[PDB]
Amino acid sequence: GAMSELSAIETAAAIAGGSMTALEACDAAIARIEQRDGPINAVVVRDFDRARDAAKAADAEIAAAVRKPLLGVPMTIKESFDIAGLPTSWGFAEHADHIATADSLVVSRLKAAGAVFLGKSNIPVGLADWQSVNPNYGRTNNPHDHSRSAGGSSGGAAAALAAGMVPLEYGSDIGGSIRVPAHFCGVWGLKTTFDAVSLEGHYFPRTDSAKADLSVVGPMARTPADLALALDITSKVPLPQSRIANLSGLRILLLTAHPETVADSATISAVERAAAACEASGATVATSSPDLPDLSALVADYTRMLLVVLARGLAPEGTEPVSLNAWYAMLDDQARMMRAFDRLFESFDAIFCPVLGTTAFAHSDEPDWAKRSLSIDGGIAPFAAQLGWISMATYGGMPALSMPLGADGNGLPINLQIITRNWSDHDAIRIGALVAEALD
């Protein structure tokens, strides 16, 4: 782009080399937020006074010859992550004054690498939407078109990255809440392998309960290099690095259709263009496989588990809740689906497919997804069916990258979803980096 910002790694290098100080990096980011966040409303919790103190402490370490991978790099994090001294509300008015007393694990890891947290980014109520709007902070608007959703639930994070306010962010994903905002705002987002990164401190307000199923946390940035560094900083253990040097020989499964939902022409064309660029770089592309799992059964099973997980096994009055024994059977079903993808990835290195079937939708005041619809090539389509596109990685557990491809006819970003086998998170990042090179 013509107007650019330093990446997270470039900022740390500029501080380590002495071309700028950590306090200057912090003050520059504070200025971008105050200058740009007016019409976007992404950074809704601000901690600028304590951040400047941390930036000064970072410059103290720099002078003492200390070097850390993110030393002095300013960032924000999704509001649902605990930071000691800041509220964690999940957009609930009842929890607006719930102040965390300890940093979450991800925050602690990033701080130990030297990062400076300026504040936290906006979310929908209960993290339960592909928008970012709540009565505590208001609505986040897509920086590419203020009339469209920024995505959710990590939508404030993606908007702050798209507007260049900070180079690094971190979100959570149970129904696409990392991939979808990255796609709506045209930035990079890694849905990580299930259980690869600790959710400690991503607590429902006033509890120490984090989701034990489907949900993952993962980095968001504007470069694949920043994603890989942030992944290595926050992983439970160091994950296998990628040995993929180029696209020659890579085996890609290209999917632009789903038995339970649809993609529009611009999205289909964009995902196809990415596969063709890899084919021109020596990769092999298939458009079907007998080992592809039953995507229709997958979305139905994923949805039943998702609803149970979201309700904590509570049923509406009158109806009978799912029994614990039935829950154990559901996990067996999921494990069986995970192994089906294992077999698929014996033949393929990656699946290429849409993140969602269309670009960022107009702001919706309808809280019930069953009462929402979407425009696909001027045609009306069901909203909730779009869950099919993100269900594979969430239910199967695979890592999935959301990376910029381009924009549609209205300038709204379109991202590609790159799905690789469990624990190959660095492959997903690396393939995305190679795809971006192949497109330029």
Author numbering: 14 to 453
Authors' account:
Here, the ligand‐free crystal structure of UMG‐SP2, a metagenome‐derived urethanase with depolymerization activities, at 2.59 Å resolution, as well as its (co‐)structures bound to a suicide hydrolase inhibitor and a short‐chain carbamate substrate at 2.16 and 2.40 Å resolutions, respectively, is reported. UMG‐SP2 belongs to the amidase signature protein superfamily (AS family), which is characterized by a highly conserved GGSS(S/G)GS motif and can be found in bacteria, archaea, and eukaryotes. SP2 shares the domain architecture of amidases, with an α/β‐fold containing 12 prominent α‐helices, 12 β‐strands, and five larger loops. Structural analysis and molecular dynamics simulations reveal that the flexible loop L3 consisting of residues 219–226 is crucial for regulating the hydrolytic activity of UMG‐SP2.
The crystal structures of wild‐type (WT) UMG‐SP2 (GenBank Accession No. OP972510) were solved in a substrate‐free state (SP2, also used as an interchangeable designation for WT UMG‐SP2 for simplification, 2.59 Å resolution) and a complex with the phenylmethylsulfonyl moiety of the suicide inhibitor PMSF covalently bound to the active site serine 190 (SP2PMS, 2.16 Å resolution). The structure of SP2PMS was solved by molecular replacement (MR), employing the structural coordinates of a structural model of UMG‐SP2 created by AlphaFold2 (AF2). The remainder of the suicide inhibitor PMSF, PMS, bound to the WT SP2 clearly illustrates the topology of the active site architecture, with the amides of residues I187–S190 forming an oxyanion hole and K91, cisS166, and S190 representing the catalytic triad (left inset). The primary active site cavity of SP2 accommodates the phenyl and nitrophenyl moieties of the suicide inhibitor PMSF and BBC, respectively, through a set of hydrophobic residues including W143, W382, L400, L319, and L323. In SP2 and SP2PMS, K224 (part of L3 at the perimeter of the secondary active site cavity) interacts with several water molecules and H215 (as well as S222 in the SP2 structure). These interactions consolidate K224 pointing toward the substrate binding cavity and blocking the secondary active site sterically (right insets). Due to the steric blockage of the active site when empty or partially occupied by PMS, substrate accessibility (in particular for larger molecules) is limited, in contrast to the complex structures with one or two BBC molecules bound. The overall fold of all structures is highly similar, with root mean square deviations (RMSD) of Cα atoms between SP2 and SP2PMS or SP2S190A of 0.2 and 0.25 Å, respectively.
